[PDB]
DNA sequence: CTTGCAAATTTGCAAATGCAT
DNA sequence: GATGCATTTGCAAATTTGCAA
């Protein structure tokens, strides 16, 4: 993947939220959108996984 | 038109822990910002929208090194 | 899936250091 | 002493976190 656009973002608070979005998305794909196991493989709480999905607008296809 | 060459971050998506990749990205991001402004801390902290005090604390935490 | 709450982490703002001129 | 800076730090508020619902 080309993630060159993250480095073009002027403000850090945006880049941190864009990366965190793309990162989780790719994880959701690698685990066929099995939330329970994703929040486990990345080391967070499932309750916090849902929260990140609502905030960053992630589509659980 | 020419565009500057950017770093390849295809490995950040390979990191296993989310918490881990957030530190690594934040590190690479700040580093590139330092270079782009030739390591002018005061200005870098302004362009990215954080307090200079935090910028120092981030450099300390992420073990970022400066030129001069 | 969402929610509470308390702890843990981070932020901004100022103030206070150092550190040479 | 003083003056310019560039690092540090002391809180309190903001934020994110885990966990048990």
Helices and strands in order:
Two copies of one chain form a homodimer.
Chain A: H1 12-30, H2 35-41, H3 46-56
Chain B binds a DNA duplex (21 and 21 nucleotides) through helix 3.
Protein name (chain A): Transcriptional regulator (NtrC family)
Descriptive overview:
Chain A: It comes from Aquifex aeolicus (strain VF5). Chain A: Zn(2+) binds at residues 11, 14. Chain A: This is Transcriptional regulator (NtrC family). The PDB classes it as transcription regulator/dna. Keywords: transcriptional activator, DNA-binding domain, Fis, helix-turn-helix. The structure is a homodimer. The first copy, chain A, is an all-alpha fold and 61 residues long. The first copy, chain A, has one domain: Homeodomain-like (Arc Repressor Mutant, subunit A, Orthogonal Bundle). Chain A contains 3 helices and no strands. Chain A has helices spanning 12-30, 35-41, 46-56. At the A-B interface, helix 1 of A face helix 1 of B. Chain B binds a DNA duplex (21 and 21 nucleotides) through residues 41-42, 50-54, 56-57, 60.
């Amino acid at each position: 993947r080309d993630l060159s656009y993250l480095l073009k973002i002027k403000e850090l608070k945006e880049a941190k939220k864009e990366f965190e979005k793309i990162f989780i998305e790719e994880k959701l794909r690698e685990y066929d959108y099995d939330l329970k196991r994703t929040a486990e493989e990345i080391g967070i709480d499932l309750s916090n996984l849902y929260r990140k999905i609502k905030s960053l607008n992630i589509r659980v296809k």
